[PDB]
């Protein structure tokens, strides 16, 4: 897959979610430039108002677009699984609140890199920081820790996202991730390393639908 990410690739994102019964759908389009670990996307809630804060959806809403330096190419599982793609599953535990469980398939459909997602959220407090919409519209920089999972011929991923709360406090979201290939072809199983992330959220001053504009940079490191 390395060769498939040398230039600007277009991206399409589709998420179907249900959090405590509140059903919703999100669509997103943009492009990724893995050579600069760059992502520019704009997401729309296609069913109306989003029943959770936009930032809680950022991790769910294409790590194959992370910049893997030359001396780490042999560790880029994400791109190695292309174009057949890979399944990405997660369990996001929101401290003192509910948890999201997600399953997605990211692969190529012609030239378009597609991320199809199903998200299920349960045990949220209808009046907590998530359902009550008390998280600020911003995003911090984190370190995504990656590990090989030889027995599953995939990887294991763990990290902690810190969502700023409107009162100055912090809402922790423990991420437990698993990625496995969709094809029966070989993939790169990586030594331990991590991805350094940063995201900036903004609004489109001409968009009336509930939405999020995301600019994100990610680069592999730790080796």
Residue numbers in the entry: 4 to 64, 68 to 229
Task: Provide passages from the article that reported this PDB entry.
In (4S)-FPro-EGFP all 10 Pro residues were replaced by (4S)-FPro (theoretical mass: 27924.5 Da; found mass: 27923.9±3.0 Da). This was further evidenced by the X-ray structure analysis of (4S)-FPro-EGFP. Surprisingly, (4S)-FPro-EGFP exhibited superior refolding properties when compared to the parent EGFP as the rate is 2.1 times faster than that of the parent EGFP in both phases. All (4S)-FPro residues display Cγ-endo puckered pyrrolidine rings apart from Pro56, which adopts a Cγ-exo configuration. Indeed, the fluoroprolines are well defined and characterized by low B-factors indicating rigid local conformations in the protein matrix. Apparently, such spatial display with preferred Cγ-endo puckering of 9 out of 10 Pro residues dramatically improves the folding properties. Indeed, 12 new interactions were detected in the (4S)-FPro-EGFP structure that were not present in EGFP. The majority of the fluorine atoms in (4S)-FPro-EGFP is involved in interactions with hydrogen atoms from neighboring backbone -NH- groups on their ‘own’ strand or on strands in the near vicinity. (4S)-FPro56 is the only fluoroproline having a Cγ-exo pucker. This puckering directs the (4S)-fluorine atom towards an unfavorable position as it is involved in a repulsive interaction (3.07 Å) with the backbone carbonyl group of Asn153 on the neighboring strand.
